[PDB]
Structure 1
Amino acid sequence: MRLPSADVYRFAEPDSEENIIFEENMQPKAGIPIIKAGTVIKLIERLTYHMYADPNFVRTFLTTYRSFCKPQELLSLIIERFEIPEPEPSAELKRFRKEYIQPVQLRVLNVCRHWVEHHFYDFERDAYLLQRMEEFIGTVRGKAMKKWVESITKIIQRKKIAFQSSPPTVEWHISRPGHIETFDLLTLHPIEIARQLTLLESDLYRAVQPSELVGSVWTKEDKEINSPNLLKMIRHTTNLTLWFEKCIVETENLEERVAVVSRIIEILQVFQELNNFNGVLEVVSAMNSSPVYRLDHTFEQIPSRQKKILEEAHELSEDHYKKYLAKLRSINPPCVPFFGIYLTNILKTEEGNPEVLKRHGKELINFSKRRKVAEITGEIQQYQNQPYCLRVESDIKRFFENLNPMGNSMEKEFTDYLFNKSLEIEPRNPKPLPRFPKKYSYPLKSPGVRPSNP
């Protein structure tokens, strides 16, 4: 083909080592080359390539472009890409319109459609970006494009306006339905504590979007603005670990404290069965905390079966989460992954690889780095699709959402309170073990973790 000159159309400049480089392998299922780096003009040309569609590149590009190109600049470049001039002067003009103009223009609309559908937050955050998108889509003329132009207008307008068999029966122990004032660790049913926390944690996990992760924004000074769902998910986790520690060390009577620790390990067992790894690690973090880890008189009295359950759970995190990773890979949804691993991998990928590659003195955007980030965000998304077949108990949910073990205390003051409580209830050797009065008027016997009805 005879494409126009570079002086009249920037995207016609031929490929070279100075403007585009590739990885050695092809896209597994498509047989398409993998772009390693390129100028933004070459990345835009390949985003809307005439020879073939490239959905993996489009998805990756739209998830990660904001580190090297502003949304306002992207819209300009795809509008410039759509305005293809005819070459300086038939058989040539008829094939150019059908094999270059029509496919490129259609790929631009596919980018616009995917942008408005999966990354609408760019438009929500910048009303002028949406104005320019609506203008440009209004200028598109052709029966070929009409169908795709109408689809984009429907997504825009919808974005502006904004399934199983029966779940198991809800489990009740000492506290009865509606007696919210008596809800506590030992009075609620251990099966139901685990189910409701798994539902809460599953929803917190599912609400985290790639916009909260790309660019490591949860670690930057605007984290509360840019990563609110992620930070709500982390804060719930931390809060539940502190609540378990607080339940333990504030139970001063040894026999009651043994019943408390034992009940938490039963909650852990149900979490393991539900594949709620976040919940498993909430419990493990509480058992491994300074105040709890040192309670030798409490752990001595724990039945062997529960010690082994806790020990296998503790092993999941050892050796850089080796067993946890193997296990998450071996299971199928529904599950609640531990988010922390992804956070470190995204951050270390972004900080350990350069933003730009240089070839013959020219700067190329390192796209492969961005692809690695998009692969981690894609893995996160794979686990957010499948919900749990468990019914919500509104009052238990509200009980766990409103837990606040720290109260008005700051972090240091509170963890110092937990540790000093631990020292009081089980003094360091050679101080003798004191006795403390019982605080629970109801029975300490657990109903177990086997469902009570068919």
Structure 2
Amino acid sequence: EQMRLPSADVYRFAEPDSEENIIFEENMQPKAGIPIIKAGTVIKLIERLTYHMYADPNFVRTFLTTYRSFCKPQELLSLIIERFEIPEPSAELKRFRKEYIQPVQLRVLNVCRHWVEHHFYDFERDAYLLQRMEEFIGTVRGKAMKKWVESITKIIQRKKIAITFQSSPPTVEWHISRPGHIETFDLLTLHPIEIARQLTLLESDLYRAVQPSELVGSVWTKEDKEINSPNLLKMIRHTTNLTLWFEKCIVETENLEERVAVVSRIIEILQVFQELNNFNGVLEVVSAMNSSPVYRLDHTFEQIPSRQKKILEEAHELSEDHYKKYLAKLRSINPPCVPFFGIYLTNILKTEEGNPEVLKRHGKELINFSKRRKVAEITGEIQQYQNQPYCLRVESDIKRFFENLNPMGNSMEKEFTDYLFNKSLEIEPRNPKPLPRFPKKYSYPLKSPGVRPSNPR
């Protein structure tokens, strides 16, 4: 006792499965026991997206995150409407309405719900697509459908429309600069703990704003990157800016003793980043210390206390052997954290570049779905670290100070990094030239308050 659908001429999804339209991986879907689709025709992918035998949330999420490389949004909506509109070929008929038509129609409605809830940007960018969605939804008749139809309508309306903690965050730390005196704020005058906390907050929010739409299709590397990946780019620019600021703070401190204090304080900020699991922060420091202007300052490094050499070296070693220790450390910690994004970017790019868009079987072209799954696994990993916020109070002046940081000024990249390098050469010339002395620039004390909270709570 099978089922008997309509002819494939009158309904395209009735076509049987074969080696020419759908193929599977060996292994079965984790938690759920469903076959893992490797490749298929777009018709077959849509059949399975809305399959009658069972629900497939994994496939729905994966498909809706990645479909745009092989199917336009308008085409997808057309296809699921076609899927929904099932003709009939009363024993055979009652069974067919209840076990094929109704399940499939429900699944289409579920796709519509997920599409609108989690990928509303398709509709923000193409108003006609929303028009069609709305008049399709208004078309839907049955009492079985009413609940889902009303929920979809409710989401659409919400989408058309334009922080506090669990218990107490720690007390904000002040060193030399007093609260409100934004004019005094600098690397050494703010408290190193609070520098790390406020940068972690900035960098956390920056990490959390990046959406899959900015990543799938490697769009951040393409000519429209500023249009399609604005949040990712702002995030990376922040990181670059801080790295550059650290380099600048170092090489513009010409007095050796003062420069030692500067580098030492930066390593203290690193230590706190590490305590906060702000790996973006960790690497923005590591990048500064490995920069050509800083790395060569052997007289400065010599004077860094041994404890802090070890702290810096441990952090450097996270990057070694293709981020081997970073990767292991990230797996082992729980949120909140701020991952380093670069690894995800390279993995997504190479996944897309390194695998074919289609596979061929018996001369027929099948969409390579496993490639898209791999990309959705990476974007899923990104999203798992975006849910949990830090339990730290924002300080609006210190935050503003780091947002408005601009070490480059009006200079271009080449000009600026040449300036930093020439500055490094001046303060510590190449052997055999002797080391000059330089006057002190800081009129306040250089001693760090350290990296332990000042008060209880």
TM-score (norm 2): 0.98
Aligned length: 452
Give the C-alpha shift of residue 88 in structure 1.
6.5
CA contact (8 A) 2:5 2:89 kept: no
Match of 1:389 in 2: 391
Give the C-alpha shift of residue 426 in structure 1.
0.5
Q: Deviations over 1:241-278 (max 9, x none)?
A: 00000000000000000000000000000000000000
CA contact (8 A) 2:336 2:388 kept: yes
Match of 1:191 in 2: 193
Q: Deviations over 1:211-258 (max 9, x none)?
A: 000000000000000000000000000000000000000000000000
Give the C-alpha shift of residue 168 in structure 1.
0.1
Match of 2:144 in 1: 144
Matched residue SS, 2:201: helix
Matched residue SS, 2:216: coil
Q: Deviations over 1:383-433 (max 9, x none)?
A: 000000000000000000000000000000000000000000001011111
Measure, in 1, the Cα distance between the counterparts of 2:54 and 2:251.
64
In structure 2, the gaps of 5 or more residues are none
Q: Per the alignment, do residues 88 and 377 of structure 1 end up closer, same or farther by CA in structure 2, a change over 3 Å counting?
A: closer
CA contact (8 A) 2:357 2:368 kept: yes
CA contact (8 A) 2:206 2:234 kept: yes
Matched residue SS, 2:160: helix
Measure, in 2, the Cα distance between the counterparts of 1:301 and 1:352.
47
Which range is displaced more, 156-165 or 274-283? 156-165
Q: Deviations over 1:355-378 (max 9, x none)?
A: 000000000000000000000000
Q: Per the alignment, do residues 89 and 152 of structure 1 end up closer, same or farther by CA in structure 2, a change over 3 Å counting?
A: closer
Give the C-alpha shift of residue 28 in structure 1.
1.3
Measure, in 2, the Cα distance between the counterparts of 1:88 and 1:448.
76
CA contact (8 A) 2:5 2:88 kept: no
Measure, in 1, the Cα distance between the counterparts of 2:320 and 2:66.
32
Q: Per the alignment, do residues 255 and 3 of structure 1 end up closer, same or farther by CA in structure 2, a change over 3 Å counting?
A: same
Give the C-alpha shift of residue 26 in structure 1.
0.7
In structure 1, the gaps of 5 or more residues are none
Measure, in 2, the Cα distance between the counterparts of 1:255 and 1:51.
73
Match of 2:114 in 1: 114
Matched residue SS, 1:24: strand
Match of 1:105 in 2: 105
Match of 1:42 in 2: 44
Measure, in 1, the Cα distance between the counterparts of 2:229 and 2:166.
32
Measure, in 1, the Cα distance between the counterparts of 2:89 and 2:229.
54
Give the C-alpha shift of residue 351 in structure 1.
0.1
Give the C-alpha shift of residue 89 in structure 1.
5.8
Measure, in 2, the Cα distance between the counterparts of 1:28 and 1:294.
50
Matched residue SS, 1:115: helix
Measure, in 2, the Cα distance between the counterparts of 1:142 and 1:177.
63
CA contact (8 A) 2:212 2:379 kept: yes
Match of 1:67 in 2: 69
Q: Deviations over 1:136-174 (max 9, x none)?
A: 000000110000000000000000013410000000000
Measure, in 1, the Cα distance between the counterparts of 2:143 and 2:206.
44
Measure, in 1, the Cα distance between the counterparts of 2:280 and 2:291.
16
CA contact (8 A) 2:55 2:107 kept: yes
Measure, in 2, the Cα distance between the counterparts of 1:343 and 1:351.
12
CA contact (8 A) 2:6 2:89 kept: no
Measure, in 1, the Cα distance between the counterparts of 2:208 and 2:180.
28
Matched residue SS, 1:363: strand
Between the two proteins, what is the percent identity of the paired residues?
A: 100
Q: Deviations over 1:155-205 (max 9, x none)?
A: 000000134100000000000000000000000000000000000000000
CA contact (8 A) 2:8 2:15 kept: yes
Matched residue SS, 1:161: coil
CA contact (8 A) 2:203 2:338 kept: yes
Give the C-alpha shift of residue 92 in structure 1.
0.6
Match of 1:294 in 2: 296
Measure, in 2, the Cα distance between the counterparts of 1:299 and 1:15.
67
Q: Per the alignment, do residues 18 and 204 of structure 1 end up closer, same or farther by CA in structure 2, a change over 3 Å counting?
A: same
TM-score (norm 1): 0.99
Q: Per the alignment, do residues 273 and 89 of structure 1 end up closer, same or farther by CA in structure 2, a change over 3 Å counting?
A: closer
Matched residue SS, 2:438: coil
Structure 1 runs (4+) deviating above 6 angstroms are none
Measure, in 1, the Cα distance between the counterparts of 2:302 and 2:211.
44
Q: Deviations over 1:300-350 (max 9, x none)?
A: 111000000000000000000000000000100000000000000000000
Q: CA RMSD in A?
A: 0.6
Measure, in 1, the Cα distance between the counterparts of 2:296 and 2:265.
18
Measure, in 2, the Cα distance between the counterparts of 1:89 and 1:117.
35
CA contact (8 A) 2:38 2:370 kept: yes
Q: How does 1:73-92 map to 2 (within 5 A)?
A: 73-84=75-86, 90-92=90-92
Measure, in 2, the Cα distance between the counterparts of 1:205 and 1:58.
25
Q: Per the alignment, do residues 88 and 418 of structure 1 end up closer, same or farther by CA in structure 2, a change over 3 Å counting?
A: closer
Measure, in 1, the Cα distance between the counterparts of 2:178 and 2:73.
54
Measure, in 1, the Cα distance between the counterparts of 2:386 and 2:238.
18
